[PDB]
Amino acid sequence: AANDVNYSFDEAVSMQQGKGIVQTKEEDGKFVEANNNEIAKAMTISDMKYMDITEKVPMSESEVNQLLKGKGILENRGKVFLEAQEKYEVNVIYLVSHALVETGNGKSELAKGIKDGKKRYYNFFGIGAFDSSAVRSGKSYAEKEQWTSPDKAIIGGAKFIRNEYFENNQLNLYQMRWNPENPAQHQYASDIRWADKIAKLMDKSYKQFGIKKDDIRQTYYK
Ligand SMILES: CC(=O)N[C@@H]1[C@@H](O[C@H](C)C(=O)N[C@@H](C)C(=O)N[C@H](CCC(=O)O)C(N)=O)[C@H](O)[C@@H](CO)O[C@H]1O
Ligand SMILES: [Cl-]
Ligand SMILES: [Cl-]
Ligand SMILES: [Cl-]
Ligand SMILES: [Cl-]
Ligand SMILES: [Cl-]
Ligand SMILES: [Cl-]
Ligand SMILES: [Cl-]
């Protein structure tokens, strides 16, 4: 069976509302727990969130660096975002947009990485535990993978997204966030607006460069 439609919307909502399941929302400058009604509203299907991001797009290094101009630690790293796109077959507009949301347009202090020994570790995609503490103990995905440079963190993030999400039939933002095939497991983030934020930047970049959209899917539930 290639049939990944497993749950009704109501069944999925109740699972997303389950015990100790971290769903969060930005209010008054920081993240708080989302209520059950906010969760249900967020997972409701309304198209960048629903677009397959497992294909390459024809963006040159010049075009990618345009997008990255004024983006902090990510500025003038378009060549490496493209190396990631071609190596791992990950949409570069998606990849850039995801990094921009997570790193605060490349300007956040956490985007400048975490020191340990003579190395510093970088993480631009919110992958695993990434804080002072976790790097110390070695319970950090970034350290395990030795993302010792920004370029390694770009390539490594794409490798992770491809191998852990795209190869797990989570092919667009909605599936990455809400995993309708298996609700409330293997979800990329706790922010209920995670997909919205990335999708917004993707859509701007699609309309800036006139890029053609890949497949859209809006059917996920019984
Ligand atoms: C991309 C990422 O890290 N999103 C984590 C998410 O973990 C997902 C499922 C994951 O893909 N985790 C990766 C790092 C890993 O491949 N799976 C688990 C790590 C579990 C974790 O991050 O806590 C493992 N192999 O041991 C975790 O559930 C949630 C609440 O803690 O906080 C999100 O920010
Ligand atoms: Cl959780
Ligand atoms: Cl070019
Ligand atoms: Cl993220
Ligand atoms: Cl969403
Ligand atoms: Cl338009
Ligand atoms: Cl389509
Ligand atoms: Cl549906």
Burial class (CB in 10 A: 0-12, 13-18, 19+), 187: buried
Domain range for 183 = 1-222
Neighbouring-strand partners of residue 119: 116
Question: If you take atom 23 of ligand 1, which residue's CA is the nearest one?
Answer: 128
Distance 218 CA to ligand 8 centre (A): 6
Q: Are 102 and 126 in contact (CB under 8 A)?
A: yes
This PDB structure is determined at a resolution in Å of: 1.5
Our count of domains for the chain comes to: 1
Distance 24 CA to ligand 2 centre (A): 10
Q: How far is CA 88 from its chain centroid? A: 15
- Cα separation, 39 vs 150, in Å, equals 34
Nearest Cα to Cα of residue 106 among 157, 147, 70: 70
